[PDB]
Amino acid sequence: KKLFLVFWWHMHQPLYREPYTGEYLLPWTFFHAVKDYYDMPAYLKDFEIKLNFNLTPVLIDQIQEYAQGKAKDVFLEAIRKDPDDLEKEEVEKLIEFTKLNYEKPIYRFERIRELMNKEKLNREELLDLQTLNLLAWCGRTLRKDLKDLLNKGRNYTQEEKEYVLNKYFEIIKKTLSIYREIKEEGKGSVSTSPYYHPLIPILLNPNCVYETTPNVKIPDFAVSFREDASKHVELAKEKYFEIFGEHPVYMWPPEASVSNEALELYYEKGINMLATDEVILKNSVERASPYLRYYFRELISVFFRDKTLSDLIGFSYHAWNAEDAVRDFIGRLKKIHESVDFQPVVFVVLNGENCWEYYEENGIPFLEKLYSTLEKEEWIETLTLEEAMRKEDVKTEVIESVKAGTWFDGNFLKWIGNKEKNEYWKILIEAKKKAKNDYILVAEGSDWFWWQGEEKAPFVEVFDKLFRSFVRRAQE
Ligand SMILES: OC[C@H]1O[C@H](O[C@H]2[C@H](O)[C@@H](O)[C@@H](O[C@H]3[C@H](O)[C@@H](O)[C@@H](O[C@H]4[C@H](O)[C@@H](O)[C@@H](O[C@H]5[C@H](O)[C@@H](O)[C@@H](O)O[C@@H]5CO)O[C@@H]4CO)O[C@@H]3CO)O[C@@H]2CO)[C@H](O)[C@@H](O)[C@@H]1O
């Protein structure tokens, strides 16, 4: 009697490329590409398990731009330059980027503490600041190859910095290939999301927010976003088809966000399976076990992720030592395995690139120990999404209706309902009336609304510049 375990790592970045200048205004796609987007599937080279991935189309666009050498990344340019050529504005951004990241485990170099305590940096100190910011984001593959440069920890030269940069771009250039390979080998399924990661239930019917938060104030949606919701899904099918050669039959709904209308749209667009969050399940049915495969109105298959297991990796186990964390995770799977006399399906679904920076050594000890243990446990079978979709020896149930929500408390409050987030929607609504191109779809991404009306400086001014630039460009 097996326990079926399904990892589904979601990868996404909003579009950081300013439409007028073409400049990538933040380096987050570059840094997660070199740290996570290649290395997370590359674990499948060394471990005989199945792992699944979601790639948003807007992320794929950016990965391709960096791989082709076309991305003009302003923070990266400040890294690459000889410090004698740095603008004062570039030295300032270098220091602010360091201070934002200072306390993360992947930044635990004694030298960074030294450099942040100095009143002013000479050329050698700036070279160490640039190169340590680079090396802090080193992924698993190159942490082996560049181990000696990493251990050095100080006194970096321009040549060593450029060497690291060349190896990083080699990693980016191989990134789409590794997703194609693990897919062709049956080592994992690859899904996508509606193109720019929007809140599909809101675009289809903004009133769905009242199913969970009736007291929320939302602006006057004086224009229809229903066609745009279709276009996000349709364009995403086309981008996936270009990259992987087939139309996707699995999709990750952004923010796990579903509604009756959204599920109908995915079904209409040929999606056969998605996943969403256990809170939505609890809100929608009485007996809310997440270990069943659900069928929404016999139209589309829906799995509900195990929220506690997903949150343990996503948020808890950074605060644990790696071995203890793996023992805790396996022990919880044991309890699930023992708690039912059927074969449970256990979906572990979370962002695949954001939690590791808070783990010791970028989560590599944790994931290596976790996957090594999993590959040898005889009562656990890890599945591709395709295997989980067609598994016959599991329990099954039909659901007729869901309560609209997201994996954030089962509601939409992180993207709508306060004055500053509502202002973004009002701006989008007014721009949509006059929109003339697909940059309006870019501005519909959830990321812009997530950061608006929050304390989270800095670079929130940069997300604001991006959103409003996309809104302006959509009208021309
Ligand atoms: O204030 C409390 C809060 O603030 C601080 O967070 C800061 C981060 O620690 C800091 O690094 C920076 O956050 C960056 C982030 O590091 C960077 O990668 C980028 O974030 C990307 C994600 O990487 C990307 O995956 C995507 O995330 C989506 C996600 O895919 C989706 O499934 C869902 O979960 O929504 C996410 C957001 O839309 O996109 C984002 C960009 O939108 O940019 C971030 C912002 O610069 O800055 C944060 C402070 O401003 C604390 O340190 C943090 O721990 C606290 O919780």
Basic shape: globular
Distance between the termini: 60 Å
Question: DSSP strand (E) fraction?
Answer: 5-15%
The main sheet comes to: 5 strands, parallel
Q: What would CATH call the architecture of the largest domain?
A: Alpha-Beta Barrel
Number of domains as seen in the coordinates: 2
PDB class: hydrolase
Keywords: GH57 family, amylopullulanase, Aquifex aeolicus, complex, maltopentaose, mutant, hydrolase
Assembly: monomeric
Entry title: Crystal structure of GH57 family amylopullulanase from Aquifex aeolicus mutant D352N in complex with maltopentaose
Descriptive keywords:
476 residues; binds a molecule of 5 linked components (GLC-GLC-GLC-GLC-GLC); Glycoside hydrolase family 57 N-terminal domain-containing protein; alpha/beta; 7-stranded beta/alpha barrel
